[PDB]
Design a binder for this molecule. Sequence first.
Ligand SMILES: CCCN1CCO[C@@H]2c3cc(O)ccc3OC[C@H]21
Lengths: 272, 337, 58, 231, 225
Amino acid sequence: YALSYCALILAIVFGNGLVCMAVLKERALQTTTNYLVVSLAVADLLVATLVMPWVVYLEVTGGVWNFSRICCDVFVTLDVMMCTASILNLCAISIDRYTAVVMPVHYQHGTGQSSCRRVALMITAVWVLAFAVSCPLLFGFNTTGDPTVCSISNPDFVIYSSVVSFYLPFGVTVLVYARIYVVLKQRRRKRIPLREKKATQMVAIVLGAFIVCWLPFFLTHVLNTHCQTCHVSPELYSATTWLGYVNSALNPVIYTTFNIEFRKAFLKILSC
Amino acid sequence: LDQLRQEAEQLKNQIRDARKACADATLSQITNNIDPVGRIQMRTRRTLRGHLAKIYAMHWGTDSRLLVSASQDGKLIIWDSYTTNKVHAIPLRSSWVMTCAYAPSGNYVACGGLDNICSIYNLKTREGNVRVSRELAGHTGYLSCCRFLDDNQIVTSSGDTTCALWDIETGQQTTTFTGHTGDVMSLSLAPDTRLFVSGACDASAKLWDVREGMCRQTFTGHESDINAICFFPNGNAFATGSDDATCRLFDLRADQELMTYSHDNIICGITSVSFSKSGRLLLAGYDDFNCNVWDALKADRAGVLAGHDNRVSCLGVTDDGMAVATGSWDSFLKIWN
Amino acid sequence: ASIAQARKLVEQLKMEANIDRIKVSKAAADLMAYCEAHAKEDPLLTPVPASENPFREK
Amino acid sequence: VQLVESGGGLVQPGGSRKLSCSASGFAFSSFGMHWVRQAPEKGLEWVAYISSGSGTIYYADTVKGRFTISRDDPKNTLFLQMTSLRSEDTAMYYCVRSIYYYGSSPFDFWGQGTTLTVSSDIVMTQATSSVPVTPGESVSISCRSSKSLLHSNGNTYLYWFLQRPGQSPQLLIYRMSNLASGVPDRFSGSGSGTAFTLTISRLEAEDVGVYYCMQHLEYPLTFGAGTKLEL
Amino acid sequence: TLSAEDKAAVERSKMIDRNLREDGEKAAREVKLLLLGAGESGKNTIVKQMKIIHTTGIVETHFTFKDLHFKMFDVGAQRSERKKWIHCFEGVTAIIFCVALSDYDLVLAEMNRMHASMKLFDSICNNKWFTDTSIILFLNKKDLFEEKIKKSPLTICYPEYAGSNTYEEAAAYIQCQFEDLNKRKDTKEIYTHFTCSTDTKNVQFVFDAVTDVIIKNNLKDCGLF
Ligand SMILES: CCCN1CCO[C@@H]2c3cc(O)ccc3OC[C@H]21
C-alpha cells in the first residue's frame, strides 16, 4: 500500500536528521571528510521532502495525474536531480577515500586549504552535474503521450541520463574501490588483524549495497525504454523504483552507524 | 641521626598540638548565620579565536582590558578583550610553553616551559617589533609558573623543586627557595608583594619571604599534588587546588585549614583556582570540561561555567573584577560576565 | 646527606614552631567582615546594568 | 629609525615626478606611512596614507587621481607618483610613520623631507598666531575644531606636533593628553569635546617653534593654522 | 561606527590572523615524533645518524626525507615527574623507543638495565595519553649482542627462557617479550627494527612506519579500519 512509502519517508527523514544533528553538534565531526556525508544526508532529506509525497499521491490515485504539466515537469526534474546528486555524492565519497589512501599526508586530519578546497570543488561539481542533467526535463524535452500520465519515456533522454547518472559514476566507484582494495592488500604483502578485514568488509558492503540498490532499476529502465522485444511489466518497474528509493533510507546506516564517533554522537543524542 | 630525627618528630608533634589548641571554632559554624549567595548565572561575552593548539596559561592585564594567552603552537597573543582585536603575536623559539606572565606596567611579558628558560619580551620597542629582552637560565627543570614583581625582577617556579628570584637587568638569580620535596607547580603573589606561596607535588604549600629568602610556614592536608594556588584578596589567606577534586582554604595567621570545597560527583582533578574581587566567590577549573563557582564562606556551589569542549587549563579574574576569562585545551578562550 | 638533611629539617621546624598564632574564630570573623565590606563593589557577585557593563554586543 | 626622502627639484607644470623614501632601522612592513605637505610659510597638509599590507589607501581631495601612491615592503621603500603637477604643489614633502593598535602612538616619527618646486572636512583653527614670551614663563596654546572629536569609544582623537626651526615636526601628545615617548613631562594637554589647550609648565629655549593641532577622527586628516612661540 | 584607528586595528588583527593561519598550515604538514629511552640505549647514535644523513632541557632535531619533514623531540635530559608534562605529547604522531640489546647481562645502580627498559616501555605504552599512538622499537646493539650471546647466556636476564642459545632465537625471544607488553594491541601497533653501524635503512624504515601510521589514521577518519 501507499503507507509503505510514508513509512520509508519517515525512516529516511529520521536517519538523515539524526546524522545532521550528529554532525552539527559534536565538535569532532566538523571535518572535510564528513561534509560529503552531510551533503548526502541533505540530498536524502530533499528527496523525502520534495519527491516522495507526490509518489505517494500517484500511488493513491493509481497513476492518474490531474495537476498541470508544469507540475509534472517540476516533479520529474526534482526527482532526477536528487537521485543524480545522491549517486554522485556516493561517487565523491569513494573518490575522497581514494585520495586519502593514495595521498595520506595531505589528507591527514581532513583539515586545511588543500582538503577544504577539493571537498568544496567535489560538492559543487556534484550539484552542478545533477542540475545540468536534470535541466532538459524542464525545457519540455520530456515528450509524452496522454497528458494524464506523468513519467519519463523519451528515448533520446533515457539512455544518456541513465548513463551519466549511474553507469559512469558506478564504474568510477567500482574501479576506485577495487584499486583501494588492491593497494591495501599490496601494502600488507609488502609489510608481511580484525581491523583491515573490517575495512575490506566495509568496502564490499558498500559496493554490494550500491549495486543491488541501483543497478537493477537502471537496467529495467533501459530495457523498458529501448528493448526491441521484452516482457517487462509495471509491477517489476514499481518494485525496482522502490528498491532504488530505499537506498536513501539505508545509506545513513552504512555511512555513519559503523563509525565510532558517529555512534557515540547518536548514543548521546538518543540517551536524552 | 636518631636524636635529630626524633627531635624533628617532636617538633612536628608540638606544632600540631599548638595548631589544634587554637581551633576553638570553625568557619562553617560562624558563617551559618549569614545569608547565602544565589544562583550565579554568567553568559559568555567574547570567544577569542586564533590559537590552533591547547591553551596552557593566561594572565589578565592591570588595565583589565589586555590579556596574554599561551599555547603550545609557539605563539603568544595579546588580545583586546573589549574589541577582540589581536594586539601582538610573538613567535616563540620553543613551542612547549607552559606558563606566561604579564608585567604590571605592561612593558614586558614572560613565559617558559620544558626549555627550562624564562624569556622576557619587550612590547614597547622603538622598532615596533616585539623582541626578547632577556633569557633567564639556571633552572634544571621545566618552568611551572612565573609572576612579575616589577619591571626589574621576576620570580619563577621550576620542576626542580625550587623557586628562584631573578634580576632581569643582571640576568642572574639573586635568591633561591629550597625545601620543597616535589616539583613546584604554581605561584601566587600577595597584594603587598612582600611574600608569596608556592604549591608542589609533595601535597604541601610553603610560605616564602622574598626579602629574607627563607620559608615562613608550611601547610599540609591535601591527599594529592597541588596544581593551583591563589591568595585571598585580603592577603591573610589563600586557596589551593589539587588532583583529589578538592579545594582547601588556609589562613596565614591561624596557620591551619579554614574550609574545604568538594563534591561527591566531582572525581577529576583541579587545574586552576581564582578568587573574586571581594573574595565572596571562588572559581576553580576542572578536567571535566567546565568550571564551578564555589561559595568561599559556605562551601556551597554557586554555579557552573559550561561551554568548553576540552579540559579547562587556566582562568583569571580581571583586576577590576568586571569579568573572568577561562582558557581550555580546545584552543578557545572565553570571557564570562 | 642524612645528617645535614636532618639538621636543616630540625632548624626549619624550630623556626616554624616559634610563630605567633591567632584563634580560628578571629580569622573567620575577619574574613567575613572583609567579604561583607567589599561585597557592594563586586561585579561578579552583584552584576552591573548594561549601562556600565563593558562586555556587551558590539 | 631613519627616513630619507629622495627626488624633487625644479619640475614644469606639464611634467611629472616620482618621490621615493628609504626606511631603515625599524619594521617598515608593519608600519603605515603618510605624506605631509608644508609649502613655504604655510602650514602642514595631509596627502595620502597606506595601511599595513597595502590593504587600504586614501587620498586628499586636492590630489585624488593626480597622485598614485605605492609601497614596496621587501625594499623598505615608499613611492609617490605625481602624474600631474600644478603651481600649488610647490612644497616640502615629509614621510611619517604610523602604527595603529591599542595604546599605539601614530605619527611618532617624521622624516627629514624633500623639497619640490614647480615653475565635510573638520576645520581646525588656532586663534593665536604668535605668542611672544621669555624663557621660564608658562605658555598656553589653544586649538578648536568644528566637530567634536570625542568618539563613542571614550577617547578624543587629537594630536599635537611641534616643528622647531629647520627641523621636521615632532609628536608631543596623542589622544589627547598622553605624553609621547622621549618628551619631557613639561608638556600637558587638556580639553573636552571641541576646546583643547596645550600648556608648558616652564618654558625653555628648546621650546621655540610652531605648534600644530591635528585631528585623527575622520579622513582626510586636517592640521591647524599653527601657533609660533618666539622670544 | 568604528573610527579610523579602530578600522586600522581591525585590519592589523586580520593580518595577524592570516599570518597565524599560514603558520598553522605550515606546521600541520610536519611530522612530530617523540624519542624515549636511555643515553646508552642508543638515542644519541640514532639522533646523530638521522641528523648526519640529512644546555639543559629537551633537544629538538629537524630532518627531511623524501620531501617529508620530521620533528624529533628528546626528553631524556628532562629527569622529573614525567606525568606532569607527558600529556604535552598527546598529539605526537609516533613514539621512538631505543633499547640496548646488549644490556641484558648488565646491572644498574630495576637492578637489571634490560628489566628497567621493559618497565619503561610498559609504562609508556600503557600510558593513558598514548592509547592511539604507535610505537617504533629500535634494537641498537645487535652487533655486540652477537659477541655477548655466544659467551654469556640469555638465561641471566630471562630465567624462564629455555630455548636455544643461538643469536636468532635470543633476538626473536627479546622481540616477542617486548611486544607482549602491549595491552592495547587492538588500538595500537608496535614496529620493531634492528639498528647497527649501518645507517641507510633506519631512515627508510622510519619513513615507511610514519607513512603507514598516517594511512591507518586517515582510514580511521574515513570510517575504514
Ligand atoms: C530510484 C530512482 C527512481 N526515479 C524514478 C524514475 O526515474 C527517475 C530517474 C530517470 C533518469 O533517466 C535518470 C535518473 C532518475 O532518477 C530518479 C528516478
